[PDB]
Amino acid sequence: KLSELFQMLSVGELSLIRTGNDGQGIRTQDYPKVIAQLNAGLTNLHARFPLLEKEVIIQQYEQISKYYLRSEFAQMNTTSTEKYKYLMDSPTERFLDDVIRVERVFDECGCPLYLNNEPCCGSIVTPSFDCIQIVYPIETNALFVTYRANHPKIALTTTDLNTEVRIPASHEKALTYYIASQLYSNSPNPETAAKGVEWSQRFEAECTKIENLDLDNAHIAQTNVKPEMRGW
Amino acid sequence: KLSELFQMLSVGELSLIRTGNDGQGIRTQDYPKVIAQLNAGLTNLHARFPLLEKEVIIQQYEQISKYYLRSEFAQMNTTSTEKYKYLMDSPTERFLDDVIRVERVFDECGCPLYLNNEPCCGSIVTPSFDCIQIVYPIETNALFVTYRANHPKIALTTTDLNTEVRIPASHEKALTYYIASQLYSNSPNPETAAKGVEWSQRFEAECTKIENLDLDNAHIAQTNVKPEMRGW
Amino acid sequence: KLSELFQMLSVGELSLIRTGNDGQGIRTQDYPKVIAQLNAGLTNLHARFPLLEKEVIIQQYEQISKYYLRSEFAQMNTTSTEKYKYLMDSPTERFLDDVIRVERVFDECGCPLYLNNEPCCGSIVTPSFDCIQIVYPIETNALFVTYRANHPKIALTTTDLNTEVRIPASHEKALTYYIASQLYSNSPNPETAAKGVEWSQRFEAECTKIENLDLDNAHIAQTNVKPEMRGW
Amino acid sequence: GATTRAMIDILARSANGQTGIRKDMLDVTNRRKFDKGEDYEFNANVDPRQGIYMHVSPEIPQSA
Amino acid sequence: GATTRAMIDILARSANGQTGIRKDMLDVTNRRKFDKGEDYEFNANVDPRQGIYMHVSPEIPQSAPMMIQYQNNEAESLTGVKSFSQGIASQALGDVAAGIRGALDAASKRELGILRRLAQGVVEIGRK
Amino acid sequence: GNQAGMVEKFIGTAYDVVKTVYDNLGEIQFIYNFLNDYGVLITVDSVTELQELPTTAKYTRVYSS
Amino acid sequence: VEKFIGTAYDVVKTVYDNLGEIQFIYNFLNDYGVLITVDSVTELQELPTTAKYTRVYSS
Amino acid sequence: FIGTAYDVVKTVYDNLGEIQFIYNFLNDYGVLITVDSVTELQELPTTAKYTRVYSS
Amino acid sequence: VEKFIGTAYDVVKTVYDNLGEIQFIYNFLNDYGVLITVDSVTELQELPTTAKYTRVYSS
Amino acid sequence: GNQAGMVEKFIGTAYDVVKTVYDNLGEIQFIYNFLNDYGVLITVDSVTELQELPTTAKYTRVYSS
Amino acid sequence: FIGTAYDVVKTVYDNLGEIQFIYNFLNDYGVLITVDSVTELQELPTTAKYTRVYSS
Amino acid sequence: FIGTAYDVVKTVYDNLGEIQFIYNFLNDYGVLITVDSVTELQELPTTAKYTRVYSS
């Protein structure tokens, strides 16, 4: 939970600094400063490691060819006045703007489609960082975009400490070292800047350790299918 | 939004500096200083990464052979007194001078044309940094220039903090480090200049990280078509 | 515009120096000092990059064999008392002495001519840095010299801040770093000279970056025509 | 058939003719002179034996 | 054809004759002397073995001729005709001498298998 | 591509209007026909202008005080 | 050379230029209605049911 | 080939002349406008000086 | 091109869109009951035992 | 895959309701049939509306004060 | 192939029209609601103005 | 070859002599200038000392 992370930061890592309040808990006024750094740390960990991969269904409309990955066009977000909401969200999968990289794209039946392929004029291109361009949209089709997902963003004004930070206990130290590095690096004092650099190096060492141990089952080899494809 | 970026700069990165106002928000008098640096940072990120690619239609006139990529000749910009507005803008695609590199040039039907090719006397040459020279213009034709696009420039006198900064959350830190580097490097103090250099190195490390992870799907390989072209 | 460049120099880059007036705008007495450095920066960028290439028509006279590239012999410059004005300028192309390098030379029909070729006694030689020697001038011919062009020089006594500085937004930082380097390097103070050297190195790094990304479409390869020439 | 296809893949998918030129080698005029086919003139900080490289197909391994 | 085209591409698209000269090698007069063809005189800070470079076409990899030969060997093994060859198959049609018929190898028998059919066609024409 | 991108680029927010017009295109043709033959009752705001109307305007309503 | 007359861009742009007239047609269809007048009752019948406002002039 | 949006746009384009004639006729002469209730009469633009209402 | 009509996603989403009606049916089945009326006693018998509430109109 | 993932994604917490409805589907059909033939006793809150009901509604209970 | 969940969902989907008709009929006209005890009568929604209770 | 702009320029150039003669005749002798309304009469240059106006 966020309370545990705040206590851990207050005593042990952010101890000899103002934000830690001498190990008596993070002040209720410095929340929008640890939370901003925490969002960056969670984004870094969720982009460098595959801690959350999710899929989103994009319903194709006859007059729309550029589909934006924004919650304003979501089926569950009822606050938006968009006439056509092509994102197909469910109470289970909500699509809270947590998109880090669009990896794979499928169709309604389940056949993979090419992504960003120029020679094949049947591929789904990506114009901008959050858009999906379908040159050939059909009113009776739906996409099945799968992406690497981010942690649901914790608002800067969040006050409830029961908001759960969903990271494995192995990356707790990596996140904490990242937060310490980011908070220690703001000041231009050489002595404090050196500590910030040391925290950055230690965070990059923890990440290297987790990569070397593959605690998230990311770098796992697959069955070779090249002989079958080449006709052996 | 711009308010979130201003708060993030004020507390955490531009903390021990005048522009940060000791972590109580950027002053309403220092806006035209963070905004000038923010425009440079957005331009750098949008030129080094393909965060926005857009197309513009250039209608050919019988008497015009040098077509300038300026909003003064746009179809939607009604403030200009130009007799012939050959840029074909729409409420969707507006062409707000956000041109970084003219990459590909097509025709009305959709057949690619050569760009800056000397031996072929049917190629679209580029005289200046914002011009398109058509040696053979026809009154019943239109171009389909596609370019890498920049973020719509935020005016130096902008006061509304609801102007949205459209960058992925992964490049938020890269942009913030760039802003810190630019603001810290103005002073000739060796101690502050060292911090500016460190921020520049950290920005160039974040950019290298994003390049290595390809979070924008930029360096993706394509299907090989050389055997087909060579007649194998 | 020049006003935006002056403001950007005043706050952010030329901040901790006299010319910046502590970030309250460049004084109306220091204009002929930023403008002199700005002209040098624009000349450097326009000579190292092809930001402006232009052509000039030189009408050949029977008694003239050495043609000088000076506005005193221009057709539009009516202030000069020259009997023969062989430069053929138009309201569109004015030839404001903005010549950086004479690259290619053509004839009236459009057939390329050799430049500075000794063995061929039909080539247009270049005696001085601004002269064009035609050993065989004909009263019924005209040249089509094409050169890399400079930014129209901003006068040292210029007071109107609406004079537009025509550079792409990607080279804004390169120009600003060059101006900072030139202004910081005048003083012999070791501490300030080090900052000037750092600005020079950063300018040369920005130029290297733009060269590596080819934002001006300069280093683009051409179609190979050697097999056709060699008879393959 | 598989070994023949592998040999053809090694010989074909490669770059036979694609010649790379170092960006900071020749100026604007010397680049045109080199492209035309005449003698060129390079800067004092670059070497012709390293700046210009013409790709050739890698040799098929003797095992195939 | 593809391998021959690749060989020609390697040999042709290269620079055969383009000679590079280092910019800071010879002064104005010595450059002219070198261009004319006489003896030159270079500065003390440059080396002639590095300043002057004449480009030559890169050598064709030995794999391309090997593949050409192999695909020209898999054709002579499928049809049966092999370039300049000594053949008896044209002299072994019909009732011939034993010595002539006794020098029939595999290629000659392959070539005779078509000759007999072509002669059967002529015999069927002659019967008509 | 089925040229849907062009429709989005130019008719992005007016596609509802365009589709509604296309749905009632037969009634659009009917309304085009009636008007053509002055089949509608033309109204004028005063006299000495009812004469300025084409003779085909068989049906007219004049406004007076 | 080739002249591009009547292509997809031309049709789409021609429709876009006439978007004001299309909007006027939509408003005329959805908001209000016009009075359609005929000469005889037979014609009232020969009229489509979309004419909810009719006037017949008889002797 | 399913160009539904382009099919609709082309079908509208083929009858664009009828729309132009209708707009010109309605903006040139001025006809009688009939509205069902008194409400949309008030919501009518002021350019329609001539109105008729049908009630029960 | 292929039109995907009636696939697994279509059926599942059609069921999901009608989840309110399914919940109403569940509440009607589990919470309360309706009064089912017939014309004669014979029909009362020809009625399933799930009709725990019956009314017969007789002359 | 047996498409159970789609059911979890869309019917994740309402699967109990869906299964309960599917269990009593025969009784659902029976209840669908009765209502169709106005076999249920329709109730109205006043008079002058019992007439507004379809003639097939043979059975009615009227509420009055 | 054992698609038990999908089999249940498809079986419900095949009879979805009956559910729609039942919901529309019950929300359109208003029928008599019968409840066994007085408790669930109070737990009934206020939308059921007509109720009958069977007791012993 | 579609040189529309050059076709127009060449067509004008072929009749340039007529334009030169017209300009010389109008600037040499001085003819009567006729203008429809009184407005363009005032907007006429002062070089036209001779004017005539047609009104109803």
Residue numbers in the entry:
A (entry chain B), B (entry chain B), C (entry chain B): 2 to 233
D (entry chain A): 387 to 450
E (entry chain A): 387 to 514
F (entry chain E), J (entry chain E): 10 to 74
G (entry chain D), I (entry chain D): 16 to 74
H (entry chain F), K (entry chain F), L (entry chain F): 19 to 74
Sentences from the paper on this structure:
We isolated and characterized two Shigella podophages that have notably different features when compared with classical podophages and instead are most closely related to phage N4. We describe the isolation and characterization of phages Moo19 and B2, including whole-genome sequencing and analysis, cryo–electron microscopy (cryo-EM) structure determination, mass spectrometry, host range studies, and enzymatic assays of the tail proteins. Our work shows that these phages have divergent decoration proteins and unique tail structures, and encode and package their own phage-dependent RNA polymerase, and the tails, which display esterase activity, are dependent on specific O-antigen modifications of lipopolysaccharide (LPS) for entry. Moo19 and B2 are similar to bacteriophage N4—these are all T = 9 podophages, which encapsidate their own polymerases—a hallmark of this phage family.
We were able to clearly model several proteins with our C12-symmetrized maps including most residues for the portal proteins, tail adaptor proteins, and tail tubes for both Moo19 and B2. In addition, we were able to model the N-terminal residues of the tailspike proteins for both Moo19 and B2 but not the full-length proteins using the cryo-EM data as these are likely highly flexible at the linkage site. The portal shown in red was modeled from residues 17 to 675 of 760 total for Moo19 and residues 182 to 679 of 706 total for B2. The adaptor proteins were largely complete with all 234 residues modeled for Moo19 and residues 2 to 233 of 234 total for B2. Last, the tail tube shown in blue was modeled for residues 4 to 278 of 279 for Moo19 and residues 3 to 200 of 206 for B2. There is no homolog predicted in the genome, no similar protein seen in the mass spectrometry data, and no corresponding density observed in the B2 reconstruction. Three major structural differences (see cartoon representation in Fig. 3B) include (i) the lack of the tail appendage, (ii) a single tailspike for Moo19 and a complex of two proteins for B2 (see next two paragraphs), and (iii) the completely different decoration proteins.
